[PDB]
Design an enzyme around this catalytic site. Sequence first.
Site, PDB file in Angstrom:
ATOM      1  N   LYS A  52      -9.407  19.044  -5.508  1.00  0.00           N
ATOM      2  CA  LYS A  52     -10.129  19.774  -4.476  1.00  0.00           C
ATOM      3  C   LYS A  52     -11.539  20.088  -4.835  1.00  0.00           C
ATOM      4  CE  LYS A  52     -11.077  22.690  -0.858  1.00  0.00           C
ATOM      5  NZ  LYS A  52     -10.996  23.616   0.294  1.00  0.00           N
ATOM      6  N   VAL A  57     -13.150  16.086  -1.421  1.00  0.00           N
ATOM      7  CA  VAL A  57     -11.776  16.564  -1.334  1.00  0.00           C
ATOM      8  C   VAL A  57     -11.566  17.829  -0.594  1.00  0.00           C
ATOM      9  CG1 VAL A  57     -10.957  14.958  -2.923  1.00  0.00           C
ATOM     10  CG2 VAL A  57     -11.459  17.236  -3.658  1.00  0.00           C
ATOM     11  N   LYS A  64      -2.032  17.002   0.175  1.00  0.00           N
ATOM     12  CA  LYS A  64      -1.173  15.870  -0.020  1.00  0.00           C
ATOM     13  C   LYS A  64      -1.004  15.590  -1.485  1.00  0.00           C
ATOM     14  CE  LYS A  64      -3.045  14.854   4.137  1.00  0.00           C
ATOM     15  NZ  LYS A  64      -2.566  15.263   5.471  1.00  0.00           N
ATOM     16  N   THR A  93      -1.068  -8.443  12.212  1.00  0.00           N
ATOM     17  CA  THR A  93      -2.338  -8.481  11.608  1.00  0.00           C
ATOM     18  C   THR A  93      -2.549  -9.695  10.696  1.00  0.00           C
ATOM     19  OG1 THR A  93      -3.394  -6.453  12.005  1.00  0.00           O
ATOM     20  CG2 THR A  93      -3.155  -7.110   9.684  1.00  0.00           C
ATOM     21  N   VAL A  95      -1.614 -12.705  11.078  1.00  0.00           N
ATOM     22  CA  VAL A  95      -2.013 -13.850  11.843  1.00  0.00           C
ATOM     23  C   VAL A  95      -3.515 -14.075  11.934  1.00  0.00           C
ATOM     24  CG1 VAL A  95      -1.857 -15.123  13.827  1.00  0.00           C
ATOM     25  CG2 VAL A  95       0.167 -13.999  12.820  1.00  0.00           C
ATOM     26  N   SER A 172     -13.848 -19.086  -6.328  1.00  0.00           N
ATOM     27  CA  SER A 172     -13.085 -19.050  -7.585  1.00  0.00           C
ATOM     28  C   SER A 172     -12.889 -20.395  -8.195  1.00  0.00           C
ATOM     29  CB  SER A 172     -11.780 -18.256  -7.563  1.00  0.00           C
ATOM     30  OG  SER A 172     -11.160 -18.260  -6.288  1.00  0.00           O
ATOM     31  N   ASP A 182      -8.898 -20.449  -0.212  1.00  0.00           N
ATOM     32  CA  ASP A 182      -9.519 -21.225   0.808  1.00  0.00           C
ATOM     33  C   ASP A 182     -10.790 -21.849   0.313  1.00  0.00           C
ATOM     34  OD1 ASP A 182     -10.755 -18.601   1.030  1.00  0.00           O
ATOM     35  OD2 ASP A 182     -11.215 -18.973   3.181  1.00  0.00           O
ATOM     36  N   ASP A 184     -14.747 -23.023   0.333  1.00  0.00           N
ATOM     37  CA  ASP A 184     -16.053 -22.603   0.850  1.00  0.00           C
ATOM     38  C   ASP A 184     -17.045 -23.643   0.457  1.00  0.00           C
ATOM     39  OD1 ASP A 184     -16.617 -19.594   2.073  1.00  0.00           O
ATOM     40  OD2 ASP A 184     -15.080 -19.505   0.357  1.00  0.00           O
ATOM     41  N   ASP A 248     -14.255 -23.315   5.319  1.00  0.00           N
ATOM     42  CA  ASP A 248     -15.544 -22.853   5.847  1.00  0.00           C
ATOM     43  C   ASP A 248     -16.681 -23.601   5.179  1.00  0.00           C
ATOM     44  OD1 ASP A 248     -13.651 -20.681   6.729  1.00  0.00           O
ATOM     45  OD2 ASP A 248     -14.958 -19.114   5.852  1.00  0.00           O
TER      46      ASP A 248
HETATM   47 NA    NA Z   1      -5.329 -11.500  10.882  1.00  0.00          NA
HETATM   48 NA    NA Z   2     -14.621  19.643  -2.603  1.00  0.00          NA
HETATM   49 NI    NI Z   3     -13.481 -17.595   2.069  1.00  0.00          NI
HETATM   50 NI    NI Z   4     -12.340 -17.974  -0.933  1.00  0.00          NI
END
Ligand code: NA
Ligand code: NA
Ligand code: NI
Ligand code: NI
Length: 327
Positions: A52, A57, A64, A93, A95, A172, A182, A184, A248
């Site tokens: 806190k 905070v 919580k 989501t 998809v 990567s 994927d 690039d 892409d």
């Molecule tokens: Na999506």
């Molecule tokens: Na605070």
């Molecule tokens: Ni990408």
């Molecule tokens: Ni990528």
Amino acid sequence: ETLNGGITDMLTELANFEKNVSQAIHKYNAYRKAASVIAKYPHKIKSGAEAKKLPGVGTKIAEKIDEFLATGKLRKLEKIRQDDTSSSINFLTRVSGIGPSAARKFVDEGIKTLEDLRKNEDKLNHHQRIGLKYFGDFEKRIPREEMLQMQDIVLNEVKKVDSEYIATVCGSFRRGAESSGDMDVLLTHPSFTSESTKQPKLLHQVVEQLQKVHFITDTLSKGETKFMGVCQLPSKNDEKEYPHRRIDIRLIPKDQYYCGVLYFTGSDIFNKNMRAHALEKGFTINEYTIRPLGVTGVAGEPLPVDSEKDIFDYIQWKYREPKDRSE
DNA sequence: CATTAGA
DNA sequence: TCTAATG
Ligand code: NA
Ligand code: NA
Ligand code: NI
Ligand code: NI
């Protein structure tokens, strides 16, 4: 980094939920800054109050945090974790092309599942269609084994259509990465730079090429500088076909490639780190250039880059092989 | 942090 | 045009 874990994770789950299921940007925005400082916090957070005291905070989060500290769980978190409505948004989501907005709307109409989605394939737009189409392959990681084959093809055509083209599979994959999510491809050609008023065909040409031979199989979106598709390695002497993959390609003014290239190769960290360094060494780096730092506060002036090297040289660093661009 | 769809 | 989605 670990002393603060569980707290920051729940804090993230919390946030995620607001941003998606609900539409509470702030709450959501709240949870994250919280989630952020508590992670920087150097000592074991032992209580609400203790937390806190932090910036960001409130009493709410604190609250919580206690309940979580107190008992290995959190109700709202348990309740959300269970909730089918919410559970669903979480899914749809995935998809490709389905965001949260859409996720919420489908859900409201009753499309919860994937199957549901098919039955109403009519309600889905192209992108989303494709998404639903390649749902499985969209999820699979790409083996560098394959990563290599793809690259082999793309460079092959690029060259064929124009010998002047410059292409780099960034990402990567560029960083050795055993796998990749994927492809690039960074494109640029000498006759395209900062000023020279476009040459849309420049993107277009190669695109053709690539679908021509059947590497590109669909188009997610294609505009004058950014192609977004699906592609696939020719299925051999059959018995084993290749999964559909996201790919892409972006065109770039040859006078910004290396930053751009630098930039996508990353890693996120290599970036900021290289980023914070160019700063002391009197510069500024971003997705397209490098500008000498002016004392008055700021300054402009795009320095001339002919390779990833020039950039380092500038900030006077050690040429970092991509392999070791990890951090 | 920006480029493309869409409606 | 705004608003969504991916990167
Ligand atoms: Na999506
Ligand atoms: Na605070
Ligand atoms: Ni990408
Ligand atoms: Ni990528």
